[PDB]
Amino acid sequence: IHDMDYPLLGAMAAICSVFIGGSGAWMLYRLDLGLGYSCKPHHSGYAPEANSFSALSCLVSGTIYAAKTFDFFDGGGTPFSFNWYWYLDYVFTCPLILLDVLYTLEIPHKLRFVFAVIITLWCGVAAFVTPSAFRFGYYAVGCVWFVPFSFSLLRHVKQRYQVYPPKCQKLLFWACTIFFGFWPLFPILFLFSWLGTGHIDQQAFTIIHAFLDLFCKTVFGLIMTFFRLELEEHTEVLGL
Amino acid sequence: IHDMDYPLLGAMAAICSVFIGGSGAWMLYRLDLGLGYSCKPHHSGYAPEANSFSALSCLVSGTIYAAKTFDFFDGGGTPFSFNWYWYLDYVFTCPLILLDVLYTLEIPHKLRFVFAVIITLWCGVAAFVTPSAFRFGYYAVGCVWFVPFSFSLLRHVKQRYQVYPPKCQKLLFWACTIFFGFWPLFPILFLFSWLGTGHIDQQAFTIIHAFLDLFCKTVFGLIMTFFRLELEEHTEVLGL
Amino acid sequence: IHDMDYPLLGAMAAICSVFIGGSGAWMLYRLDLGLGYSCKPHHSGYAPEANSFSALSCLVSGTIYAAKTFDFFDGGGTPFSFNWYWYLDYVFTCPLILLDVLYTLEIPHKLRFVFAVIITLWCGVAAFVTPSAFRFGYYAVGCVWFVPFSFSLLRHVKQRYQVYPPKCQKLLFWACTIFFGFWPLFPILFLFSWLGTGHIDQQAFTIIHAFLDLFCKTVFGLIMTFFRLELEEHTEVLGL
Ligand SMILES: CCCCCCCC/C=C/CCCCCCCC(=O)OC[C@H](COP(=O)(O)OCCN)OC(=O)CCCCCCC/C=C/CCCCCCCC
Ligand SMILES: CCCCCCCC/C=C/CCCCCCCC(=O)OC[C@H](COP(=O)(O)OCCN)OC(=O)CCCCCCC/C=C/CCCCCCCC
Ligand SMILES: CCCCCCCC/C=C/CCCCCCCC(=O)OC[C@H](COP(=O)(O)OCCN)OC(=O)CCCCCCC/C=C/CCCCCCCC
Ligand SMILES: CCCCCCCC/C=C\CCCCCCCC(=O)O[C@H](COC(=O)CCCCCCC/C=C/CCCCCCCC)COP(=O)(O)OCCN
Ligand SMILES: CCCCCCCC/C=C\CCCCCCCC(=O)O[C@H](COC(=O)CCCCCCC/C=C/CCCCCCCC)COP(=O)(O)OCCN
Ligand SMILES: CCCCCCCC/C=C\CCCCCCCC(=O)O[C@H](COC(=O)CCCCCCC/C=C/CCCCCCCC)COP(=O)(O)OCCN
Ligand SMILES: CC(C)CCC[C@@H](C)[C@H]1CC[C@H]2[C@@H]3CC=C4C[C@@H](O)CC[C@]4(C)[C@H]3CC[C@]12C
Ligand SMILES: CC(C)CCC[C@@H](C)[C@H]1CC[C@H]2[C@@H]3CC=C4C[C@@H](O)CC[C@]4(C)[C@H]3CC[C@]12C
Ligand SMILES: CC(C)CCC[C@@H](C)[C@H]1CC[C@H]2[C@@H]3CC=C4C[C@@H](O)CC[C@]4(C)[C@H]3CC[C@]12C
Ligand SMILES: CC(C)CCC[C@@H](C)[C@H]1CC[C@H]2[C@@H]3CC=C4C[C@@H](O)CC[C@]4(C)[C@H]3CC[C@]12C
Ligand SMILES: CC(C)CCC[C@@H](C)[C@H]1CC[C@H]2[C@@H]3CC=C4C[C@@H](O)CC[C@]4(C)[C@H]3CC[C@]12C
Ligand SMILES: CC(C)CCC[C@@H](C)[C@H]1CC[C@H]2[C@@H]3CC=C4C[C@@H](O)CC[C@]4(C)[C@H]3CC[C@]12C
Ligand SMILES: CC(C)CCC[C@@H](C)[C@H]1CC[C@H]2[C@@H]3CC=C4C[C@@H](O)CC[C@]4(C)[C@H]3CC[C@]12C
Ligand SMILES: CC(C)CCC[C@@H](C)[C@H]1CC[C@H]2[C@@H]3CC=C4C[C@@H](O)CC[C@]4(C)[C@H]3CC[C@]12C
Ligand SMILES: CC(C)CCC[C@@H](C)[C@H]1CC[C@H]2[C@@H]3CC=C4C[C@@H](O)CC[C@]4(C)[C@H]3CC[C@]12C
Ligand SMILES: *C/C=C(C)/C=C/C=C(C)/C=C/C1=C(C)CCCC1(C)C
Ligand SMILES: *C/C=C(C)/C=C/C=C(C)/C=C/C1=C(C)CCCC1(C)C
Ligand SMILES: *C/C=C(C)/C=C/C=C(C)/C=C/C1=C(C)CCCC1(C)C
Ligand code: NA
Ligand code: NA
Ligand code: NA
Ligand code: NA
Ligand code: NA
Ligand code: NA
Ligand code: NA
Ligand code: NA
Ligand code: NA
């Protein structure tokens, strides 16, 4: 039950908020500094509108983990708790992470992809709060939205993986590893959680997701940031 | 009260999810196939961004009816139930249906119209959960947003009903019949429901709305899809 | 506690809904009338898409105050009550007010600014419902998002305050006074409220916020409307 050693989870949540939140703040600073590695002024002058999704996803996640930190240190149940409804926080963060990939890579069908992940996460929120055997009904519906989304999105990334120069491809390889290697790791964790098989307790479930958000938001956002800097440093700083 | 024969409503909800959800899936397949009846590749190559609203509205509604199916078969009240808050589901579906009309017909004031329907539905959600005599206060406020919206939107459709060729006008006539003939049928049903006059019980209220969503989303979405195909088959496949 | 003389607050809420709601309705009428003071037809023909934020913010606020009026006159606690969760209503209105400034003045970073105010208000909603000493944790996180937002947004406004002619600058001065003089007055009120210091009771807290919304939405929206009319009357009606 809710015997999760909140001081440990509150301390863990505080670290995630600082590192995830701090990483987002750093990315905002780098946005309004230049185009690529060189301090070349932006064509519009301030920054492209679509370059802030990597920074915003970490800032929003860092803020949400700050809310988690308050909830844990408050002793457990709180009127405004992101820990009560699992995957509810990811509803407002995954679209930003996804939009970072779509706009950075110029992947079409940006409207369909965003809806496919929002509904995927909402099915997770509904699956979590359902105490009956129908919790896997919502889970199945979520996978129906997710599997075509991941496979369809993967195909688009492969198409545009070729145009980029080999130097940028190395950075895009590690972004793909996190995006296509860690995102499908959340539904797997659901099956093995206390709601599913039972091999992962709630306290350990929070800790693992804390590390997943570090890679999915901070590490992934920084990789996208440096991929973008490398992309601009080669495309619009000296030609081609 | 809540004596609604959930097995009947769950079975009905399952049919709606498959047909509405399946219709949305079919429309997605047709999008990435060609411009019109002929398999002419799209100008952008994949598809226009605004052609997915018809498909997304049915997919979202089909997913929501899947959630309704779980709620009904679970025995009634569920922690994640779309049946507890009536008209809450339409908040996330009507804008998609409306945006299908606005972008397909290129009707201006797309920002005002979307807000007018979202507030209209929210007043319905508030009107439903209010047990006091003020439930008609929210209903009246909803109609204040709806009547100018329907009349103002109707005027715009009449303006652009003339430019389209007679073959496309026939398809637009039936889209207008559903959009301007069934949408005002929901507020009428509210007055005659158990909350209003009392002539429609809750069980019958769900069944009627199930059929309305079949016409408002599946039939309407398909009519828009074929109107779009007919429009493209005449405008950007052979000239004018 | 909840001894707030609801008939007084309901009567006050009704006045705000009519004046704020009515002002938004008036601004919609002026939009589809002409460009500036003269009745010059719009370049697009109907209206720019970004000119409706001033009208929509008042219409949404007027509608929400109508919901508040029902909640107060119903006797207090209501299933659909905007008065139970303070600052929840501002989540759906402040972005519209902010977007009015951003699009009217063409301030870049429109995506970052909107997120900075939505998270700022959500921290206020969480801060309000928290009964523990951590209510100031959410408040502090909200100020962390707000102070950089207000200072960063202020710098942008100063940059574009110079290009406009002196006649338009006078109208922009009073918009800045409300935007940068009243917005920071809400967090100050939180500290002195019954949740903070204790010098402002809940009944007086509602009355003060009623007057703040009159200036922040109605007066501010009208100033933006006339600033826009003055701007168009000088830029795209006779040249420069
Ligand atoms: C359910 C939660 C889902 C979360 C997703 C929310 C994020 C929404 C994604 C926004 C997509 C916007 C596309 C960005 C790329 C556009 C690039 C561009 O040109 O920008 C257009 C222009 C900026 O550039 P200009 O100054 O015109 O520069 C051109 C001259 N140099 O305006 C824009 O940036 C587009 C609009 C900006 C945002 C408008 C508001 C949209 C909503 C914001 C977030 C709120 C929704 C999330 C709700 C939070 C929970 C309640
Ligand atoms: C309260 C619930 C309300 C529900 C409404 C949500 C739907 C929001 C409507 C989105 C409007 C977008 C306009 C679509 C037409 C634009 C056509 C276009 O050119 O697309 C721009 C470009 C795609 O094309 P490019 O690759 O640039 O192609 C050009 C080169 N060939 O990007 C776009 O599609 C625009 C932005 C895409 C979506 C961005 C995210 C917006 C939010 C998504 C839905 C989430 C909100 C609903 C919340 C769900 C409940 C929590
Ligand atoms: C969490 C609550 C946050 C609230 C914020 C919601 C507001 C979202 C802001 C929308 C930003 C749109 C930018 C407006 C400027 C664009 C100007 C423009 O050219 O418009 C594009 C074109 C209109 O013009 P055309 O007919 O192409 O004219 C060109 C030929 N003369 O389309 C548009 O207006 C852009 C898209 C319109 C809105 C699409 C739907 C977006 C969502 C609407 C609000 C719903 C979200 C709020 C949720 C409410 C709570 C559940
Ligand atoms: C119901 C209307 C919902 C409308 C949306 C409003 C937003 C919700 C804001 C929080 C209000 C919560 C009030 C709950 C009252 C206290 C209940 C409580 O104690 O909490 C839990 C139950 O309630 C919750 O925990 C509800 C938490 C809701 C949190 C949802 C957060 C959504 C915010 C969106 C943010 C978008 C991203 C921006 C970042 C924000 C950073 C702060 C335990 O319940 P008890 O009453 O003790 O009963 C059990 C004891 N026998
Ligand atoms: C309060 C914070 C709200 C913040 C938003 C969070 C989203 C809500 C997700 C569901 C959490 C529900 C937890 C409720 C706990 C159980 C309560 C319950 O049993 O259910 C009902 C009451 O609660 C409900 O039914 C609440 C249902 C909320 C559903 C709202 C769905 C919104 C989702 C948006 C989706 C956007 C579109 C994507 C498609 C999704 C497809 C799955 C009966 O109440 P009891 O406690 O039995 O009391 C009566 C017994 N004497
Ligand atoms: C929980 C799922 C949330 C999902 C979103 C659904 C939207 C919520 C719509 C309102 C449903 C409220 C049902 C609450 C059941 C009654 C509870 C009640 O009596 O009210 C309060 C508690 O509940 C509330 O007050 C919840 C109010 C939620 C209002 C949130 C409004 C959000 C709407 C967004 C609108 C977007 C802008 C458009 C303008 C709309 C204009 C109408 C007092 O509680 P009692 O049960 O008496 O317990 C105390 C007695 N010992
Ligand atoms: C430790 C406390 C202050 C929180 C710091 C969190 C953020 C701000 C820190 C954590 C790790 C940091 C990154 C570590 C390594 C690099 C590589 C270097 O070539 C550029 C800076 C960059 C990308 C750093 C930016 C700042 C960073 C993202
Ligand atoms: C493949 C796509 C198109 C269809 C997806 C159908 C999914 C949602 C269906 C297939 C089998 C179904 C499950 C079959 C049996 C049960 C047992 C019951 O006591 C609870 C519901 C539950 C667990 C069902 C939930 C819904 C379910 C998982
Ligand atoms: C559990 C996790 C960490 C490991 C799984 C990582 C997976 C997702 C990684 C490992 C190898 C990667 C692939 C390596 C090569 C290519 C070819 C390129 O043209 C498109 C991307 C694509 C197809 C990558 C997609 C992501 C990928 C499949
Ligand atoms: C019965 C089960 C499989 C659910 C099927 C639901 C969806 C996929 C079905 C229901 C009715 C079907 C439509 C029936 C008639 C036509 C007209 C034809 O000229 C093109 C296909 C089209 C438009 C069909 C597409 C698929 C469709 C929309
Ligand atoms: C026409 C526009 C601009 C104004 C709309 C005003 C509407 C919202 C007003 C007009 C008359 C009002 C009703 C008058 C009397 C009552 C009885 C009371 O016990 C509950 C509220 C209720 C039912 C009111 C709700 C609000 C109401 C319906
Ligand atoms: C109860 C329902 C099914 C029947 C009511 C259907 C109504 C909404 C239908 C019946 C006839 C239709 C009208 C027929 C002709 C025109 C002229 C055209 O230039 C614009 C659309 C317009 C104005 C239609 C709007 C929709 C309409 C009024
Ligand atoms: C009193 C009742 C009807 C509610 C009226 C509310 C709205 C519609 C009223 C309140 C104050 C009014 C404004 C008062 C002064 C002016 C200045 C004038 O040069 C143009 C009209 C304008 C801008 C008015 C427009 C209508 C207005 C905004
Ligand atoms: C400046 C930025 C980057 C960091 C902001 C840190 C804020 C959120 C920190 C600084 C000091 C903290 C407070 C320190 C002590 C307490 C007492 C405790 O019983 C409740 C929480 C509370 C009230 C903390 C809430 C969070 C807090 C306000
Ligand atoms: C409590 C409230 C009502 C009074 C405080 C009003 C403040 C916010 C007002 C008073 C004077 C105003 C400043 C007057 C002059 C300028 C210079 C211009 O180039 C940019 C705006 C700017 C910088 C204004 C910003 C808003 C401002 C600082
Ligand atoms: C930073 C957080 C991220 C990137 C979270 C991603 C989460 C998912 C891809 C979750 C997917 C799920 C499904 C496929 C179905 C079942 C429920 C979920 C929510 C675990
Ligand atoms: C697929 C579902 C659709 C198209 C639903 C449409 C619903 C409406 C137009 C509802 C309108 C209402 C009002 C006019 C006021 C009172 C409340 C409503 C919600 C019934
Ligand atoms: C019409 C209403 C408006 C313009 C409301 C504006 C509200 C704010 C700027 C609120 C700000 C807050 C913070 C800075 C932190 C603490 C909580 C708030 C919500 C009071
Ligand atoms: Na957000
Ligand atoms: Na994936
Ligand atoms: Na990727
Ligand atoms: Na949705
Ligand atoms: Na209508
Ligand atoms: Na129509
Ligand atoms: Na709204
Ligand atoms: Na400010
Ligand atoms: Na301003």
Author numbering:
A (entry chain A), B (entry chain A), C (entry chain A): 17 to 256
The authors write:
Kalium channelrhodopsin 1 from Hyphochytrium catenoides (HcKCR1) is a light-gated channel used for optogenetic silencing of mammalian neurons. The genome of H. catenoides also encodes a highly homologous cation channelrhodopsin (HcCCR), a Na+ channel with >100-fold larger Na+ to K+ permeability ratio. Here, we use cryo-electron microscopy to determine atomic structures of these two channels embedded in peptidiscs to elucidate structural foundations of their dramatically different cation selectivity. Together with structure-guided mutagenesis, we show that K+ versus Na+ selectivity is determined at two distinct sites on the putative ion conduction pathway: in a patch of critical residues in the intracellular segment (Leu69/Phe69, Ile73/Ser73 and Asp116) and within a cluster of aromatic residues in the extracellular segment (primarily, Trp102 and Tyr222).
Remarkably, this third channel that we named HcCCR is Na+ selective, with a relative permeability ratio PK/PNa > 100-fold smaller than that of HcKCR14. HcCCR is further characterized by a smaller relative permeability to protons compared to Na+ than that of typical chlorophyte CCRs, and so is potentially useful as an optogenetic tool for neuronal activation that is less likely to produce undesirable acidification of the cytoplasm. On the outer surface of the HcCCR trimer 21 sterol lipids are bound, which all were modeled as cholesterols. In HcKCR1, the Asp116 side chain is H-bonded to two water molecules close to Thr120 and Ile73 in the nearby cavities. In HcCCR, the water molecule is H-bonded to Ser73 instead, and the other water is missing. This is likely caused by the bulky aromatic side chain of Phe69 located in the interface between TM2 and TM3 (Leu69 in HcKCR1), which also influences the position of Asp116. A possible mechanism for this selectivity is that in HcCCR, Ser73 directs its side chain towards the carboxylate group of Asp116. The distance between the OH group of Ser73 and the COOH group of the Asp116 side chain is 6.2 Å. It is possible that in the open state, these two residues stabilize a Na+ ion in between them, whereas this tight coordination may be unfavorable for K+, thereby substitution of Ile73 with a serine diminished K+ selectivity. The S73I mutation increased K+ selectivity of HcCCR5, indicating that the polar side chain protruding into the cavity is a determinant for Na+ selection. Presence of Y222 instead of T222 in HcKCR1 occludes the channel pore compared to HcCCR.
